[PDB]
Amino acid sequence: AHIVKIYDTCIGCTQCVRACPLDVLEMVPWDGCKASQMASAPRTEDCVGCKRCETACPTDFLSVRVYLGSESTRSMGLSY
Amino acid sequence: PTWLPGLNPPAHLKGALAGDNGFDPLGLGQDEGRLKWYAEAEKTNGRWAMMAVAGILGQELLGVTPAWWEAGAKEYDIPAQALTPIEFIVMGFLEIKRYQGFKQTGTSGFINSFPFDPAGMNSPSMATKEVKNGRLAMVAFIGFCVQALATRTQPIEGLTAHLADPFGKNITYYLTHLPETL
Amino acid sequence: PFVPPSWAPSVFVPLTGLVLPAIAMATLFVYIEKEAP
Amino acid sequence: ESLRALVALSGIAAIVTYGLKGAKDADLPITKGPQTTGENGKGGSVRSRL
Amino acid sequence: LDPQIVISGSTAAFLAIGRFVFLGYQRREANFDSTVGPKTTGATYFDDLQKNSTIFATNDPAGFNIIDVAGWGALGHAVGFAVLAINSLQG
Amino acid sequence: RPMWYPGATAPAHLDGSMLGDYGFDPLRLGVNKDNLKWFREAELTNGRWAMAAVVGILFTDAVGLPKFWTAGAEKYALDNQTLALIEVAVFAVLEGKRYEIYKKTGETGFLSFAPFDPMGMKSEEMKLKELKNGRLAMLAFLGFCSQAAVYGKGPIETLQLHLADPGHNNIYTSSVGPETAVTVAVLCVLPMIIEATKTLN
Amino acid sequence: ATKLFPKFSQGLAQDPTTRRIWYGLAMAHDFESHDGMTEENLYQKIFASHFGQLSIIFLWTSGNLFHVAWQGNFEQWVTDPVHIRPIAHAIWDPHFGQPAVEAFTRGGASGPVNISTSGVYQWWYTIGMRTNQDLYVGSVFLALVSAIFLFAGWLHLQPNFQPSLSWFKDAESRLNHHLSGLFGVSSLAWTGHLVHVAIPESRGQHVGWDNFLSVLPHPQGLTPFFTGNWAAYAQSPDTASHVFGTAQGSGQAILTFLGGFHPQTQSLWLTDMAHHHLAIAVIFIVAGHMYRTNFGIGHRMQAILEAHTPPSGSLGAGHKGLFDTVNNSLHFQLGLALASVGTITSLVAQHMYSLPPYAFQAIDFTTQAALYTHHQYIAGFIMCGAFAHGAIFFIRDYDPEQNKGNVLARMLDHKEALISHLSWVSLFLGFHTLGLYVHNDVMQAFGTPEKQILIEPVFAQWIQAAHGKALYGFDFLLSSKTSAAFANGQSLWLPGWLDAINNNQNSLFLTIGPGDFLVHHAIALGLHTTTLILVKGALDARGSKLMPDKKDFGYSFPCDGPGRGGTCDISAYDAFYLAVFWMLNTIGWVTFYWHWKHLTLWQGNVAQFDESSTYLMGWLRDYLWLNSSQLINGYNPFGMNSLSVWAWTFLFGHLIYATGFMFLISWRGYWQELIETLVWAHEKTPLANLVYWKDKPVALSIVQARLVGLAHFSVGYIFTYAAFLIASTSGRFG
């Protein structure tokens, strides 16, 4: 399983969620920014680490990171 | 007691181990159990050194033909090649006896399945004499070795050649007149 | 006092070329695939 | 373990005996050898060197 | 050309020059407690073959142990044999 | 339980339940309880044939008859090719029952009909006595094969060559002699290492 | 599943792929990142591993002694070594045919032996071996010593003898023993061996373990040593009419200072090497009493580091707090060690081609070639390792607050200046070197060879005139007869050095010209470039502007994906990865250059070098093309000869090399899809869907394939060049 962490510079623009091809990110209520939202990663056992969430983040140096870790049969994307 | 005129004895002299003179300038004898192993090793090196000095001095006083260093290769009846394994076997048995007693029960020496003391006396006045003569004999035997290497003499030749001329025939002579003696 | 015999390459070469690789690879292959209880 | 021991027994008892009774010419090496003094003195091209 | 005069005078000179004038300057470098006094805060063997064990006692009024004698005598011997060796190659 | 070097350990499956168990297995061969069941009769039969071979190897070299390493070489006997085929059939037949009677009963007997005891003789604690004799005999057979080696005379002839004679002609004054001294010195110092393995646990 | 292998990393022994096998082979010696690794356990494992390495080294040397003594002809080689070739070992290959074995049987042997281009024969003849028996004794001894080291390595893991952590990290007590004991006493004892055995064997005598106790090494003997008459050990040295292995012109001296070469053997005198090891033994033993142990007079390294901060603050804190990072980290110490050992290795090579120590070296030319090339390549790899462990130090063991203001933080503060100026010098040397070579090529291609730039290397020729090479007409400091240095050294150690430096037949201070100018600049380009890549990788390991948290990923991580324009090869591992290619190139240049200059020296025409060395067609035609004539004729449809094995290795190298390109050029995912279709095919095939994988097959990961491609590149490169060098030099002169 990989390590996906959301940081506090998030502005809650939902770009990371629409870019995730595996549905491991979701938007939770929050009271720290104008949009009153913040991303969260409740299902990092389904993540494969494609790093589209990092590409979609607008704020400079990113508000979401994907640290690579120990692979499994789901995090390798093996269909056989 | 201690080697220097003045020393606070370290953590190997409490008041007594076998016979102690507070001489650990490097500081090895500290690990517990290990100092006991060193004590037994000191005793047994002394034992072989006492038997060795008795050996050389007994060879020379009883009038054997070669000196003690050329005594390995005269001739014998077996004579030389089959003398190693027998030694190894005999010393094996005795020695694994010694160790396998010393490890389990008797933290002193013995020879065969004992604490060995058939017809003798056991008191610290004998233990200190044993250790002292052992040290004396180790130093003595290394004296024989280096003295024989430099002078090419049997030991009593050295002692009488020194008693015939104290001022002279010293270590300075035999180290600065080396082609004379070779 | 030490000399290896004349027939020594003939025996020791295929031993270390074929046998020890075979035992090594078979043993290691059983070791790799073992499941922990 | 049984047949795995059997292949060890047979593999050893085949290869080790191939060493000293695979002398059915092995093409060159086994005591058929160089019957000519092949390249003893021929070593170098400019300097001979044996 | 006496070896005893050269070596004995050498070691005497160096023991004197270490005795009287270079003692305190050598003892100002004993104070390393500003940076290191616990070389090893250890409990057992493998730590006290590395920590101090014995203290060589001196009734010497200034306090030369056998170690300072060994050091200054060693330098004296090195320099004395250097003098004899430079004298050795035919002047 | 007198171990193979005076103060020793016991490997963790050679307790005192076997017969000749002096606790010697340094290479961990019989670690199964399935090969012990088999190595026991390997031990007993390998030893047993050698016990039956020592008698022949001594009598043929006491009475006369040409020396054993050239026994079958010259042969006044019959038809070298086919009597081996006689030496196949009766044996394989016999082996069927040896292995079968090994399988059906527990680890003891072999002959064709039953655990073979036509006498009322010892079937007791003295099976260790004959396996002890056997493991003596196996060592005795290798010596004779090393006498068909280096000296080339028979058992009793070299027995006369040394065994009325001093230690001037023995192993170490012979062809294969410098290696035996090394092996004696190495084997003798070996339990001194095995003790160091288990002193530091 | 949760397989056993490997036990050091639980997360690795978890996945059902074949990644676990390769990674389990790859992370075995990464002790710092196993499961449950404390610090004491780390040091103890490193200690036992060192013992393992020592065991392997000594066992290997015993192997060399054994094979030389058994299958070689060292007993016959010592009678005439300008003749019968060395023998390494004998071959028993059942694949051979009749002319193969008929060909390989060379050197006076009776079967397929192959020549020993290693220099062990000259080493063992110089130090004092003469027969086989001595070699066997040495082999048995070294095998025994290897067994001792292996046993000790097992010993110090047993829980009663495991040294505690603070026994390690004891700097001051380790350096006194290393410097005094390990260097000084070893050097003193080696002097003992030279004086007692090696010299009287070179006078003609058999000083063995028998009767070395009863033989005078010098016919006065320890009288002048204890009197102070030491120059009486140098009177009447070996005459210049000497014959080495006999007593002809034999002297009596044991400690001289002559310089120069031996007039008949083209090596240094043995007496000088005795004197040298004696002198530096004294120096090292004296230098071993600097630091403090459980006594008085010693030094503290922390005080020494603390007091060296300069006033005016040109350095911030100077060396404050370095001692708690040199002591606390292993990659820092390993980096320093690899740096020093690599530079010393280069020095070994550079001195051993020019000042050959061993008897009848430099008349076996293949020995010279292989030795120098070997040590150069070894030095290259070692230096690359030094910078790699620098990068690992920065990522894993660096701490900023402990290093606030020392020189180590200053180096991280202005690193762009460093990288910029390394870039500048690399560019400058590249443009001008390549430009001058291309210009000379164009001039040579057209009919005008006099229209080309040939700069004379006047600096190095100034230096060579400073050392005594009286050919350039400069007349100063050692070439002038009225200098102070010349007159002071004249009486004892100059006249050998001048006769050895004015000879134009040895390798000592070869004559140089414009080709050497150009090639030396090429070499400087190699060094500055490789330093650029490595230093950039090291200093940008904490983070860059493309990525300011590179420290959170560790040393060797793949990439950061397609974002921000895509970041391939961003790790420090990949910087070192790029640097390896430059190392191979640069050593290629120095070794091509050395080899060709000495080929033209040994053949006879230095003119060919001094003319054709100034334009790249000269290299391609006169070195690579002309000298590969006897190599590729190692076998043809007409027959084969000795150098057929080399002519097969020579293609083998190319094959590995070209396979190396595959893992570099074609990156991963293509292979992932291909392997997936293969999985389908084996899954649906009848009569072969009865055998399955236990661990699912996947393609090699991004990081691994770089290492594999580099392995093929390096191995093929080395095998190809070794084949060409051995085959060419031994085909001509051998």
Ligand code: CLA
């Ligand atoms: C480590 C150094 C070393 C090396 C590289 C070689 C290399 C070779 N030896 Mg050899 N040998 C060595 C040391 C070495 N020897 C020593 C010390 C001895 C004395 C016991 C011998 C005795 C010996 C004989 C008698 C013969 C060879 C032969 C050979 C050749 C065929 C390979 C073979 O069967 O070897 C077999 C080698 C051995 C049996 C000795 C190795 C013993 C040590 C304990 C093993 C080392 C283990 C190793 C480090 C672990 C690597 C494996 C691991 C990756 C899984 C080959 C050139 C054959 C030959 O000459 O053919 C022409 C041959 O017949 N060797």
Ligand code: CLA
């Ligand atoms: C070859 C026949 C043979 C066989 C099958 C056995 C079998 C056995 N013995 Mg054994 N033994 C034998 C001969 C044999 N012995 C001989 C000849 C001796 C006297 C030297 C002994 C002395 C002995 C003792 C003292 C003990 C055993 C024990 C055992 C049992 C457990 C140990 C084990 O796993 O061994 C398995 C062993 C094998 C399967 C043998 C494999 C053969 C190897 C691979 C080749 C050996 C060749 C040899 C090294 C080279 C020739 C040697 C020569 C130069 C001296 C096992 C049933 C132990 C036990 O439980 O008590 C009964 C025990 O304590 N044996």
Ligand code: CLA
């Ligand atoms: C005098 C005592 C002594 C001695 C001899 C050693 C010796 C050694 N220690 Mg050591 N050590 C000591 C005291 C000593 N130590 C003390 C007191 C401590 C506690 C502080 C330690 C703590 C310690 C640690 C923690 C470690 C060692 C290690 C080592 C080994 C280093 C590896 C090696 O082989 O280097 C060999 C080096 C040389 C021979 C010198 C090379 C000099 C130059 C560079 C080479 C060129 C010279 C010449 C040209 C070569 C000729 C080539 C020839 C083939 C022609 C070495 C055996 C390491 C080891 O391997 O552990 C097993 C290790 O990890 N020691």
Ligand code: CLA
């Ligand atoms: C003093 C010697 C020394 C020591 C003790 C170390 C120790 C270490 N290095 Mg290091 N290193 C060294 C020299 C050394 N290195 C040199 C000289 C280089 C330059 C090449 C490097 C380059 C280097 C890198 C780049 C890295 C390390 C890493 C490491 C650490 C883990 C090693 C590991 O897991 O590898 C496991 C070892 C293997 C899997 C072996 C691979 C086999 C290689 C590819 C050679 C194969 C060639 C093949 C045998 C040819 C056969 C030919 C055929 C025809 C027969 C470890 C602390 C790694 C680290 O710290 O990770 C963060 C790391 O990333 N080192």
Ligand SMILES: CC1=C(/C=C/C(C)=C/C=C/C(C)=C/C=C/C=C(C)/C=C/C=C(C)/C=C/C2=C(C)CCCC2(C)C)C(C)(C)CCC1
């Ligand atoms: C009692 C007293 C006194 C006196 C004192 C003294 C006098 C002392 C001395 C001391 C001494 C007298 C010491 C010495 C020491 C010595 C030494 C310590 C040495 C060393 C040596 C060396 C070091 C050497 C080395 C070497 C060699 C071997 C050779 C050459 C080279 C070399 C150098 C390396 C008086 C009267 C004052 C008063 C007070 C009291």
Ligand SMILES: CC1=C(/C=C/C(C)=C/C=C/C(C)=C/C=C/C=C(C)/C=C/C=C(C)/C=C/C2=C(C)CCCC2(C)C)C(C)(C)CCC1
């Ligand atoms: C990355 C890193 C690292 C590494 C680094 C390195 C790797 C370095 C190298 C370096 C080097 C590798 C250097 C070199 C140097 C050298 C030198 C510096 C030289 C000098 C010389 C001299 C000084 C000489 C002189 C002389 C002459 C000129 C001649 C005559 C004689 C005489 C002596 C006078 C470390 C680990 C630290 C850590 C951090 C990071």
Ligand SMILES: CC1=C(C/C=C(\C)CCC[C@H](C)CCC[C@H](C)CCCC(C)C)C(=O)c2ccccc2C1=O
């Ligand atoms: C061919 C290739 C593969 C496919 C490689 C595979 C599937 C592995 C092929 C190796 C086979 C299975 C065995 C090779 C035989 C070797 C001798 C094995 C050596 C093993 C050591 C332990 C000795 C990649 O996955 C890849 C990934 C990234 C960049 C380039 C490439 C690439 O070029």
